[PDB]
Amino acid sequence: GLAFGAIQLDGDGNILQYNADITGRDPKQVIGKNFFKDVAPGTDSPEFYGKFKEGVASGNLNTMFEWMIPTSRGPTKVKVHMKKALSGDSYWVFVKRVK
Amino acid sequence: GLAFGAIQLDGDGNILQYNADITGRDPKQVIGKNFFKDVAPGTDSPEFYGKFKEGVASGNLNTMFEWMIPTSRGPTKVKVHMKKALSGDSYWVFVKRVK
């Protein structure tokens, strides 16, 4: 069988999206990028990325903390929950605004 | 506003999928990979990748050709149409089985 019916590529040939029933979509164009180092660089620190690596390495990631997003108009507090997925080898980061 | 509600990461912190209304999904886990060099290496040749680079470089990609997929049970012929997207800077590869 054919894996894809239509594949969307950038000018370098890298896959953006595809149709196969099955669709790959990435409206923010972040899939494959590193969350800590590329997409949300404020998280690239021992207080966030550090806790992620610890939980991955221990095999038991389940940590919750508050996080400040500095802005031009003052910091915004969010609640972060990082947790290993219940099925398979992957991890979820949940972000919710506090109050 | 918050860009993501839930982000799925691999053990290295690379983004697999996300929820934001907006969802990023990649069931084949190929977004961000190179179509010609990683995902479909048989296309990494002047007869396919070469035509893609030509059309991207010329600014007018619109080429159609037949392509053979060797298998353990004999080759399968497909029809390939590569075309620049009508809106924005991206390119579509369409693959259809011949007859």
Numbering used by the authors:
A (entry chain A), B (entry chain A): 25 to 44, 48 to 126
Manuscript text:
Through the whole of our study, we crystallized the FAST protein several times, either in the presence of various ligands or without them. Surprisingly, we found that the protein adopts a form of the ligand-free domain-swapped dimer in crystals under a wide variety of conditions. In this dimer, the first three strands of the core β sheet (A30-L33, I39-N43, and T50-R52) are exchanged with the corresponding elements from the symmetrical molecule, forming together one large twelve-stranded β sheet (ESI Part 3†). Contrary to X-ray data and in good correlation with reported previously, both forms of protein are present in solution exclusively in the monomeric form (the determined hydrodynamic radius was 2.1 ± 0.1 nm, which corresponds to the 15 kDa).
One of the most promising protein among various FAPs is the so-called FAST protein (“Fluorescence-Activating and absorption-Shifting Tag”),14 an engineered variant of the photoreceptor from Halorhodospira halophila – Photoactive Yellow Protein (PYP). This photoactive protein covalently binds a hydroxycinnamic acid.
